[PDB]
């Protein structure tokens, strides 16, 4: 027993007594585990034993103890974990694994990058943001081995420890695997009674957005334990909070005799997957009760479709039906999976073609910025391997392994393709499968797989003559295969027609947009750019808290709520409308930009379902079918 250890245990006990939020978070974890255990006993998931701790509240309580954790975590974190374990055991007396700690809040000078990490930050609690490049296999590590002696019929055990579990170093005592007991009898290993804890190591290098553009990047190794394994995949943007530790002796032994130096790695306490622009992490946000109440209030209005669409990109004049189509695509529709394994599409694909400088790439960049899992792609920059998938070779296992392309990483998301007309033929054939069958089939040397690629696709194309011609037929203007046009749900032809009143309105809108100042900024001060990183949980400027038009952060809340909560179903009143419209459109005589196939009926169904998702309605109504038909009729005519 150590006196300073006990004093720090008492100090963290006082800190936990002051802030009841950690105490009843522990209580909530315990009652959830007990309820699941009782449900398993009578008739599942288990929560890990760790608590998120705010460093700011600790700094408010005890600055000395906060600076002790930040500067010397090996002496301060284990007393805090011991105090948390004692408190949890005190509340567990009425209803075994020790409790862990996770740290959040401002770190100050300890918020670093893999390039910025030096050895002055060793043995310190650091927060490191970067991109995951390598993710090793989750391997079980033996902690306690249980053996059976048949001559005496007795169960023995042995505990094993290493340097990566404990923060403070101890004497390395290598206990071998016991195969005979003290008296020499044979011991048989009892698998299933031995304890194995999952272990992973990941490689985090600095993100290419703030990496220097010229030279090589720097990377670090992060060790993760049972409750932190499989929280990441390669390509994620992460913030890892952990102790920057050094292990072993840097060749100073006689047996070791090389200059690798002291090996340096982070004992990860916390892993946050952050959402960045055009990455594989989906943007998720906490929905408070006030926000849900506001969403429900907007659900009862009759003009809600005209409010959410016009509030998408208020800096772009016109293109109202394009805004409606983008909103209905963001709703996503409903996919159908039948009992025979068949899959029916839910996602909506939008193609826009027309004259240059018609706010196409700006709309693409908006959908990239406002969707949860939008990934941006250009025409000639990406190829067949970069779009679907590719095959590389693992260094450790020695076998081939898969790299997920742009379209696979945007599963349950949006693929924002710019300059669609310049794509290669092999790309077109590859994406024929993805836009309809919603999968990617890989048949390479030794690898035959099927990857889910359920995506919405926005494409921006350009006519082969540079400008759209009214008198010419649209098949020559678009100059795309009929199959590709059949894959896209909606096709919008945008024409930069000149009119004096309309051009006056465009000019006034552009100048009014160009007379904007951010809040808290001076007249001459340039607006600063901060790179947008968001944690993933689980022309009027003054649009704030649903006054006339929905602000963008609340619009994302509305979209997220409508995606997870409501799943509408069809009813015969909408069915008669969509059947009449589809069978009329197949037998219309007027020339259409898009050819009419059996897919158009499913586009009608998807648009009706998306409009029902806008209304937060459990069913699809007749007005939803009318809106779905009238939106498609504009895109067709």
């Amino acid at each position: 027993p150590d006196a300073v250890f006990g004093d720090r245990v008492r100090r963290f006990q006082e800190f936990l007594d002051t802030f009841t939020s950690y105490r009843d978070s522990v209580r909530s974890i315990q009652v959830y585990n007990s309820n699941n255990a009782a449900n398993y006993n009578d008739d599942l998931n288990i929560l890990p034993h760790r608590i998120i701790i705010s460093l700011d509240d600790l700094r408010e309580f005890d600055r000395s103890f906060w600076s002790g954790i930040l500067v010397e975590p090996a002496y301060f974190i284990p007393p805090a974990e011991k105090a948390l374990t004692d408190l949890a055991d005190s509340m567990d007396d009425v209803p075994r694994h020790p409790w862990k700690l996770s740290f959040k809040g401002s770190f100050g000078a300890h918020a670093l990058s893999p390039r910025t990490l030096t050895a002055q930050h060793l043995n310190k609690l650091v927060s490191v943001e970067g991109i995951v490049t390598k993710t090793s296999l989750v391997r079980p590590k033996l902690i306690r081995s249980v053996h059976y002696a048949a001559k005496t019929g007795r169960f023995h055990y042995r505990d094993y420890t290493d340097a990566t579990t404990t923060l403070t170093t101890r004497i390395p005592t290598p206990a071998i695997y016991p195969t005979e007991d003290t008296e020499g009898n044979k011991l048989t290993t009892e698998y299933g009674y031995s304890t194995f804890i999952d272990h992973q190591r990941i490689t985090v290098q600095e993100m290419p957005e703030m990496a220097p553009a010229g030279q090589l990047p720097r990377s670090i190794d992060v060790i993760l334990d049972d409750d932190l394994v499989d929280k990441t995949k390669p390509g994620d943007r992460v913030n890892v909070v952990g102790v920057f530790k050094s292990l072993g002796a840097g060749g100073m032994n006689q047996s070791n005799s090389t200059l690798i130096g002291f090996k340096t790695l982070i004992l990860g306490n916390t892993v946050y997957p952050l959402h960045a622009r055009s990455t594989g992490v989906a943007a998720r946000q906490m929905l408070t009760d006030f926000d849900i109440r506001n969403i429900n209030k907007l659900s009862k209005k009759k003009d809600i479709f005209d409010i959410l669409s016009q509030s998408l990109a208020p800096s772009i004049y016109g293109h109202d039906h394009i805004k409606k189509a983008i909103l209905l695509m963001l709703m996503g529709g409903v996919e159908k999976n039948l009992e025979n394994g068949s899959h029916l599409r839910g996602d909506i694909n939008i193609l826009m073609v027309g004259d240059p400088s018609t706010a196409k790439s700006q709309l693409l960049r908006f959908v990239l910025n406002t969707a949860s899992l939008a990934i941006a792609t250009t025409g000639r920059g990406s190829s067949g391997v970069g779009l679907t998938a590719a095959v590389t070779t693992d260094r450790e296992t020695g076998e081939r392994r898969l790299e997920a392309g742009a379209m696979v990483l945007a599963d349950r998301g949006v693929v924002c393709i710019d300059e669609f007309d310049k794509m290669t033929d092999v790309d077109r054939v590859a994406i024929h499968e993805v836009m309809e069958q919603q999968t990617v089939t890989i048949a390479k040397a030794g690898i035959h797989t099927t990857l889910n690629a359920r995506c919405s696709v926005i494409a921006a194309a350009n006519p082969v003559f540079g400008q759209y011609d009214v008198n010419r037929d649209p098949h020559q203007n678009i100059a795309l295969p009929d199959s590709l046009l059949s894959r896209f749900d909606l096709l919008f032809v945008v024409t930069d027609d000149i009119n004096e009143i309309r051009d006056r309105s465009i000019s006034e809108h552009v100048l009014r947009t160009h007379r904007y100042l951010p809040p808290g900024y001076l007249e001459g001060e340039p607006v600063r750019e901060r790179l947008n990183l968001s944690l993933a949980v689980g022309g009027n400027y003054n649009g704030t808290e649903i006054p006339k038009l929905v602000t963008i952060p609340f619009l994302r809340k509305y979209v997220q709520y409508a995606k997870e909560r409501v799943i509408p179903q069809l009813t015969q009143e909408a069915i008669n409308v969509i059947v009449k419209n589809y069978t009329d459109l197949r037998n219309d005589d007027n020339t259409k930009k898009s050819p009419i196939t059996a897919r158009t009926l499913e586009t009608l169904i998807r648009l009706a379902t998306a409009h029902a998702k806008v209304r937060l309605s459990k069913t699809v109504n007749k007005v939803d079918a009318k809106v779905a038909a009238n939106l498609l009729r504009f895109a067709l005519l």
């Binding site: 400088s357 552009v510 100048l511 100042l517």
Partner: protein, 167 residues
């Protein structure tokens, strides 16, 4: 030939650029004499003495002083258009596209060089740059007039070289 006929790329790329310049070989004796004389002054060293004397005079600055001034202007100032200067921009931007509209209706053929909303934002950017020249937090009408003068000297004479955009 048309200006878009001379380029070995798409005519939309010209619309991607904010300002275009057509550089002409006028072939005048009084001009090439002056150009040749200037090159001779470069080669003898009289131009070096003239530029040093002009820098000491105060009507030219050094390249490193220009570099630091550019950095200071970009890091310190970012002007905003005055409300009174927006009406001139909108009116003189819509008159140009009205002229191109009537030219296209008369010619019944699309012009090889276009002017779009991107060009309006280009003229706005030129005005804000001329306002950023004197570390001015606000842009006045005198910047708008000069920005329009540069646009006329750069993109509109190129459009007039296009005989669809002329007439």
């Amino acid at each position: 030939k048309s200006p878009g006929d001379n380029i070995d790329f798409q005519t939309t790329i010209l619309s991607r650029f904010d300002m275009i310049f057509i550089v002409k070989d006028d072939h005048n004796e009084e001009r090439d004499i002056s150009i040749a004389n200037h090159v001779i002054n470069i080669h003898t060293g009289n131009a070096n003495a003239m530029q040093n004397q002009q820098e000491e005079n105060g009507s030219e600055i050094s390249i490193e002083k220009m570099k630091r001034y550019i950095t200071y202007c970009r890091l310190k100032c970012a002007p905003r258009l005055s409300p009174q200067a927006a009406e001139k921009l909108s009116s003189n931007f819509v008159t140009i596209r009205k002229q191109l509209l009537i030219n296209e209706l008369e010619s019944t053929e699309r012009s090889s060089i276009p002017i779009t909303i991107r060009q309006l934002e280009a003229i706005i950017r030129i005005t804000e740059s001329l306002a950023k020249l004197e570390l001015s937090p606000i842009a006045q009408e005198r910047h708008v007039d000069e920005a329009i003068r540069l646009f006329q000297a750069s993109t509109m004479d190129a459009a007039s070289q296009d005989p669809i955009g002329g007439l």
